[PDB]
Structure formats: structure tokens, C-alpha cells
């Protein structure tokens, strides 16, 4: 029932892992090596994206927004977006079911 | 629209601040000085609690769980709990509005 987003971290590839799931949400960790891109990403429900460590750029619509450690964005359901890592980064993606 | 949990942090008092809210959630930052206690905390919706910086002990039921940086727990609505800060800590409390 406690999950540790900063244990088991790896930057040898882009890693996407569901760390926990309940009836309402999935809690997903993304480990992004510096320079990794996640393009055309779309989740089936509303999400929030938070940088636990590192720094990304996040694109949605015609916007491009830097997200240093601690930054959070929330999106409505099914909105297409892109993540680019500027450093090795650990992201929490919280997905509504 | 982008909120920055680690800007504007202060440890002179226990601080609870809604940094953003949308249709489904309020995103709340708790800044806890070392030694601060939030006891008998109960939220009206399902929550998740995650340590962004620091370290706390989280109690629920008869359990006492250590939460270092990065640890996350999720609770159903209305479940009573306690947070104790073992260091100056910044916590994200994500509160469902359902």
C-alpha cells in the first residue's frame, strides 16, 4: 500500500510502469533518460503529470512549457501531448479511470 | 495551469495551500516544518499523499508507515489519518472532488 517512486529508478531506456492502481486511479512512474521523447501521448482519462526529479518540457496545443522538479500540470481526458526530458527525470503520471 | 510545488516553500509554520483546482481534483501543497503534526486529518474525497521533499510518518488504522521522498499512499474518502514530519517536508495532497 505505500509505493516508492524513487526506488527502482533506471535511465537505461524510457520506462513506463504502473506502480499502483485502485478503483479510481492508476499511479504511473515514467523514468526518462536525458533526451528521451514521448510524443503523441494520449491517456484515456484526465491526468496529472508531476516532475519528481529532473526537468522536462511539456507540449500541449500550441504551447511548450518547461517543467522543472516540483512542477505539475493537469490535463482533461484524451488531450494529445508530448514530453521531452532535458535531464534524467522521474515523472508521476496520475490517471483517472 | 503549471504549478510549482517547490517554489515559495516556507517552514516557519505548517502551511496548507490549494495550488490549483480543476473539475476532478484540488492539488494541495502541505509544507511541514520538522516536528510538525497534522493529527485527525480527514478529507471529504479520495486522496493521494506523496512526499516531494523530506520525510514523514503517516498513520492510518493501526499502522505507522515511514514515507521518505517519493513515497505515495492513497486513501478512500473520509479515512482518518495523521502525518508527522521527521524533517522539513513538502507534501502533495491530491484531493478528488467526486
The domain in which residue A12 lies consists of 1-97
Residue contact B96–A46, C-beta within 8 A: no
Residue contact B68–A96, C-beta within 8 A: no
Query: For residue B20, what is its C-alpha cell?
Result: 490549483
Residue contact B72–A48, C-beta within 8 A: no
Contacts of B61-69 with CB under 8 Å at 24 or more apart are: B65/A1, B65/A2, B67/A2, B68/A4, B68/A6, B69/A6
Shortest distance, CA B20 to any CA of chain A (angstroms): 9
d(CA A67, CA B23): 22
Q: What is the resolution of this structure in A?
A: 1.4
Question: Could you identify the residue written with the cell 503523441?
Answer: A40
- The neighbouring-strand residues paired with A8 are none
Rg (CA), chain B: 13
Nearest to B71 among A4, A48, A72 (CB): A4
Instruction: Give the SS3 label for residue A92.
Output: strand
Residue contact B3–A94, C-beta within 8 A: no
Number of domains, chain A: 1
Shortest distance, CA B52 to any CA of chain A (angstroms): 7
Backbone breaks in chain B after residues (C–N over 2.5 Å): none
Provide the 10 A C-beta neighbour count for residue B11.
Answer: 17
Nearest to A27 among B67, B68, B72 (CB): B72
What ranges make up the beta strands (E) of chain A?
A: 3-4, 15-21, 25-32, 37-41, 47-53, 55-60, 63-68, 71-75, 81-85, 89-96
Shortest distance, CA A28 to any CA of chain B (angstroms): 11
| Residue A69: closest CA among B24, B6, B8 | B6
**Angle value at C-alpha A89, between B88 and A44, nearest 5 degrees:** 105
Contact A93, A48 (CB under 8 A): yes
| Residue B87: closest CA among B61, B59, B52, B63 | B52
The structure's method of determination equals X-ray
d(CA B95, CA A43): 20
Provide the 10 A C-beta neighbour count for residue B85.
Answer: 24
- What chain A residue is nearest to B29 in terms of C-alpha separation? A70
Amino acid at each position: 500500500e505505500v509505493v516508492h517512486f524513487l526506488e527502482g529508478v533506471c535511465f537505461e531506456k524510457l520506462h513506463i510502469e504502473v506502480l499502483n492502481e485502485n478503483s479510481s486511479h492508476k499511479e504511473i512512474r515514467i523514468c526518462m533518460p536525458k533526451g528521451a521523447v514521448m510524443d503523441k501521448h494520449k491517456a484515456p482519462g484526465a491526468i496529472s503529470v508531476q516532475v519528481l526529479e529532473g526537468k522536462i518540457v511539456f507540449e500541449v496545443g500550441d504551447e511548450k512549457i518547461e517543467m522543472p522538479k516540483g512542477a505539475l500540470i493537469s490535463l482533461e481526458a484524451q488531450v494529445l501531448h508530448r514530453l521531452d526530458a532535458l535531464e534524467n527525470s522521474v515523472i508521476r503520471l496520475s490517471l483517472s479511470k
